[PDB]
Amino acid sequence: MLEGKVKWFNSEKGFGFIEVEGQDDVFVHFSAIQGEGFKTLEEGQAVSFEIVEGNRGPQAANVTKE
């Protein structure tokens, strides 16, 4: 699992970017967010996650709020 920080997140639209040291920023969609409750992220929130890449390029998967 990768560790990173939420760079920014549009809570209304349900998407943002995770920033991570060395690597580029990682697009995160709300459907990647684990746990219970309404799925959203806060700027600067610590997350653990993976990067999954299909034919639309890399994005965050299995994002867990730490």
Residue numbers in the entry: 1 to 66
What are the paper's exact sentences on this?
BsCspB is a relatively small protein of 67 amino acids length that belongs to the cold shock protein family. Notably, BsCspB shows an overall thermodynamic stability of about ΔG° = 10 kJ mol−1 at T = 298 K and possesses fast unfolding, ku, and refolding, kf, rate constants of about ku = 12 s−1 and kf = 1070 s−1, respectively. Our findings show that fluorine-labelling of proteins utilizing singly modified amino acids like Phe or Trp does not cause a detectable alteration of thermodynamic and structural properties of BsCspB.
Focusing on phenylalanine modified variants, 4-19F-Phe-BsCspB deviates most in ΔG° from wild type BsCspB by 1.5 kJ/mol. This property of 4-19F-Phe-BsCspB has been one rationale for the crystallization of this variant enabling to obtain atomically resolved information (see below). The samples crystallized in a closely related crystallographic lattice, containing one single molecular copy of modified BsCspB in the asymmetric unit and sharing a same space group symmetry. Furthermore, wild type and 19F-derivative structures displayed identical conformational rotamers for the modified Trp and Phe residues, indicating that local structural distortions had also not taken place. Interestingly, these slight changes are independent of the number and sites of fluorine atoms which have been inserted into BsCspB: one fluorine atom used for 19F-Trp labelling (sequence position 8) or seven fluorine atoms used for 19F-Phe labelling (sequence positions 9, 15, 17, 27, 30, 38, and 49). To our knowledge, this represents the first three-dimensional structure determination of a fluorophenylalanine-labelled protein possessing more than a single fluorination site which has been reported so far. This result shows that 4-19F-Phe-BsCspB folds fully reversibly and that there is no apparent long-term folding rate constant additionally present which may explain the gap observed in the amplitude analysis of the kinetic data.
